[PDB]
C-alpha cells in the first residue's frame with residue numbers, strides 16, 4: 001500500500017512523534033539492495049529510544065525503555081537486501097514482551113525491570129539529519145540512512161502517508177517503488193566478474209578476473225619481468241601473519257617460457273606450508289602444502305606459453321582445490337592421502353620466481369590473493385613491498 005522510494009541513503013522524512021507508551025505495534029514492508037541503513041528512529045526523555053535498521057542485510061530492532069539499550073535480531077535465513085519485498089512486524093505488550101516478525105520467522109524477547117517507553121522527538125523514517133548520526137545511541141550501528149522502498153507503514157491504527165503527513169522531507173523521495181531498472185544479467189560484468197546489484201544500477205567485483213574498471217574490462221596493474229630476472233615480495237607485518245582454511249588466487253600473465261615460477265606464498269621459517277603457482281612444460285599449475293603431502297593441480301591441456309594473455313584462477317578449500325585457465329573447463333582436485341585444512345602463518349608473497357630458481361620472464365597483471373591486490377600495492381609503494389632486479393611497472 002502506497003509505496004514510497006528513498007532514492008538516497010541521506011533522504012528521510014520526519015513524522016509526528018510515535019506514541020508507544022504502554023504498548024507498541026509497528027508494521028511495514030521494505031525492499032532494498034543495500035546491506036546497511038537506518039530505517040526508523042524516535043528518541044524520548046532521558047535515554048529512551050527505538051531504532052529499526054539494516055546491518056549486513058539483517059533487520060535489527062534496537063531500543064531503550066529507560067533501563068538500558070537492548071538489541072533484537074530479526075530472524076532470517078538470508079540477508080534481506082535481495083531486491084524483494086519483506087514484511088516487518090514489531091510489537092511490545094504491556095508487560096514488555098517484544099515480538100519481531102520478519103516474513104514468517106518470529107523472534108521474542110522480554111525486558112526485565114523496564115516501565116514505559118516515553119518517546120518525544122519526531123519519528124524519523126528513511127534516515128536522520130547527517131549530524132544526528134554522531135549522537136545516536138552507542139548500540140546503533142548505522143552511520144547512514146536507508147535506501148530503497150517502504151510501503152504499508154502502520155504505527156498501530158495510524159497509517160501515515162510518508163509524504164503528505166511528513167512534517168519535513170529531505171532529499172530524493174518519490175511516490176511508487178522506483179527500483180533498479182538495470183538489473184544484474186549473466187553478461188553484465190566481463191571476464192567472469194561478479195555482478196553486485198545496487199539501487200540505481202550495478203557494480204562489478206573484479207577480484208578473481210585479473211582485470212579492473214567498472215565492468216572488469218580494463219587491464220589490471222601490470223609488471224614486466226625482463227633479462228636477468230626480478231622479484232616483488234610482500235612481507236606480512238610479523239603480527240598480522242594470516243592462517244586460512246580457504247584461499248583465492250587470480251593473476252593474468254603472458255610469457256613464452258616452458259618453465260617458471262610466477263607466485264609463491266610461504267609460511268614463516270620452520271613451517272612447511274606453501275602455495276606455488278608455476279609453469280611446467282608450458283602448462284600452468286599449482287602445487288601446495290598445508291601440513292602433510294604436497295597437492296598438485298594442473299591444466300594439462302592448455303598450452304599457455306604462446307606469448308598471449310591468459311588468466312588463471314585458483315581456489316583452495318582445505319585440501320580441495322580448483323584451477324581454471326581462461327574459459328576452459330574448471331579442474332577439480334580432491335586429495336589422495338590424508339590432509340589438514342589450514343594454511344598456517346603465511347609470511348611472504350614472492351612474485352617473479354628468481355629466488356625459487358625458476359625466474360619468470362614476461363608480464364604479470366592484476367594479482368589478487370585473499371583480499372590483497374598485490375601488484376596494485378606495489379604500484380602504490382606499500383611499505384611491506386620490496387621490488388628487486390629487472391622488474392618495471394607498465395605505466
Ligand SMILES: *[C@@H]1O[C@H](CO)[C@@H](O)[C@H](O)[C@H]1NC(C)=O
Pocket residue numbers: 317318319320334341
Ligand atoms: C572437500 O571435498 C569433500 C567432498 O566434496 C567435502 O565433503 C569436504 O567438506 C571438502 N573439504 C573442505 C575443507 O572444503
Ligand SMILES: [Ca+2]
Pocket residue numbers: 273290291340341342343344
Ligand atoms: Ca597447516
